[PDB]
Design an enzyme around this catalytic site. Structure first.
Site, PDB file in Angstrom:
ATOM      1  N   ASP A   1      -9.683  -3.823  -5.095  1.00 29.25           N
ATOM      2  CA  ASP A   1      -9.085  -2.907  -4.133  1.00 29.25           C
ATOM      3  C   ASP A   1      -9.815  -1.569  -4.120  1.00 29.25           C
ATOM      4  O   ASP A   1      -9.750  -0.808  -5.086  1.00 29.25           O
ATOM      5  CB  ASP A   1      -7.603  -2.698  -4.455  1.00 29.25           C
ATOM      6  CG  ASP A   1      -6.843  -2.026  -3.324  1.00 29.25           C
ATOM      7  OD1 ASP A   1      -7.454  -1.273  -2.532  1.00 29.25           O
ATOM      8  OD2 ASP A   1      -5.612  -2.239  -3.233  1.00 29.25           O
TER       9      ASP A   1
ATOM     10  N   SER B   1       0.822  -1.201   0.000  1.00 27.18           N
ATOM     11  CA  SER B   1       0.000   0.000   0.000  1.00 27.18           C
ATOM     12  C   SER B   1       0.868   1.266   0.000  1.00 27.18           C
ATOM     13  O   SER B   1       1.593   1.507  -0.960  1.00 27.18           O
ATOM     14  CB  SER B   1      -0.970  -0.044   1.183  1.00 27.18           C
ATOM     15  OG  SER B   1      -2.056   0.856   1.001  1.00 27.18           O
TER      16      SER B   1
ATOM     17  N   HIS C   1      -7.877  -5.007  -0.787  1.00 25.59           N
ATOM     18  CA  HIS C   1      -6.636  -4.304  -0.460  1.00 25.59           C
ATOM     19  C   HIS C   1      -5.692  -5.129   0.410  1.00 25.59           C
ATOM     20  O   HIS C   1      -4.485  -4.915   0.392  1.00 25.59           O
ATOM     21  CB  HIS C   1      -6.933  -2.990   0.250  1.00 25.59           C
ATOM     22  CG  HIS C   1      -5.735  -2.104   0.393  1.00 25.59           C
ATOM     23  ND1 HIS C   1      -4.972  -1.707  -0.682  1.00 25.59           N
ATOM     24  CD2 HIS C   1      -5.193  -1.507   1.484  1.00 25.59           C
ATOM     25  CE1 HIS C   1      -4.005  -0.907  -0.262  1.00 25.59           C
ATOM     26  NE2 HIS C   1      -4.119  -0.770   1.046  1.00 25.59           N
TER      27      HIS C   1
HETATM   28 CL   LIG Z   1      -9.074  -1.864  -7.721  1.00 24.49          CL
END
Ligand SMILES: [Cl-]
Ligand SMILES: [Ca+2]
Length: 258
Positions: free
Chosen positions: A176, A130, A208
């Protein structure tokens, strides 16, 4: 190639939970200068020579624990793996980039001798989740001598990465909602030069936090990417080129052959 480690790979071996090398850890205090400390995973066996290293960053508000599963899984394939904590949980991608570099320099300059005497300090890589994935990108611009970079569902406000000269493997999560692939991962990948050895792998139906959960699809190609570029190990080219088509993969882009 003097950097080759471990038996010749197969489709099964790159999917194995535990690779050929046994793994030990060394803990690094939070008082380390330039980053939040962390855990060093390293191969115990030394009879094949020294190993390249990868520093691994977590994301916004997350800690080293979200990335722990990479430690043994990757180190057991013959890598030194440093899962770090950041100075604060709120650090931005650029900061995470600096902290990845500070972690690698810690390995080279200050780590315990059990680690340092196993380390090839010229063969270093970055990986992150991330904002830490944004940090992986940032680190490569800050240090082009890095061998590889693996941004995992990366997040970054800066969308252009044409200055990157380090082989970069971006993993995206189809669903995500926190770093949407359409505004983060894919813009980043397409912005990378078409001449750079690079790849994009999008995970079908993943969210995510797919990189925070043991994932054989992520592991096998993370391993292959580090083998190919940290060890210059073309035994692993077969798994990267042409594009993998695992059922688990929604889409894959690459500049194969490398
Ligand atoms: Cl996405
Ligand atoms: Ca510190």
């Amino acid at each position: 190639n003097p950097y080759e480690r471990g038996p010749d790979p197969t489709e099964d071996s790159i999917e194995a939970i535990r690779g050929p090398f046994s793994v030990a850890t060394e803990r690094v205090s939070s008082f380390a200068s330039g980053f939040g400390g962390g855990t060093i995973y390293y191969p115990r066996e030394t009879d094949e020579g020294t190993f390249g290293a990868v520093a691994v960053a977590p994301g916004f508000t997350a800690s080293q624990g979200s990335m722990s599963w990479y430690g043994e899984r990757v180190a057991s394939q013959g890598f030194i793996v440093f899962t770090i904590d950041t100075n604060t949980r709120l650090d931005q991608p650029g900061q995470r980039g600096r902290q990845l570099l500070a972690a690698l320099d810690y390995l080279v300059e200050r780590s315990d001798r059990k680690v340092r005497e196993r380390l090839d300090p010229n063969r270093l890589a970055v990986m992150g989740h991330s904002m830490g994935g944004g940090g992986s990108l940032e680190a490569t611009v800050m240090r082009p001598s890095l061998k590889a970079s693996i941004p995992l569902t990366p997040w970054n406000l800066d969308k252009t990465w044409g200055q990157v000269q380090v082989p970069t493997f971006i993993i995206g999560a189809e669903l995500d909602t926190i770093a949407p692939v359409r505004t983060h991962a894919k813009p980043f990948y397409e912005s990378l030069p078409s001449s750079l050895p690079k790849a994009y792998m999008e995970l079908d139906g993943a969210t995510h936090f797919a990189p925070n959960i043991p994932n054989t699809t992520i592991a096998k190609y993370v391993i292959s990417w580090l083998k190919r570029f940290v060890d210059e190990d073309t035994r692993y080219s077969q798994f990267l080129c042409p594009n993998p088509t695992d059922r688990a993969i929604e889409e894959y882009r690459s500049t194969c052959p490398y």
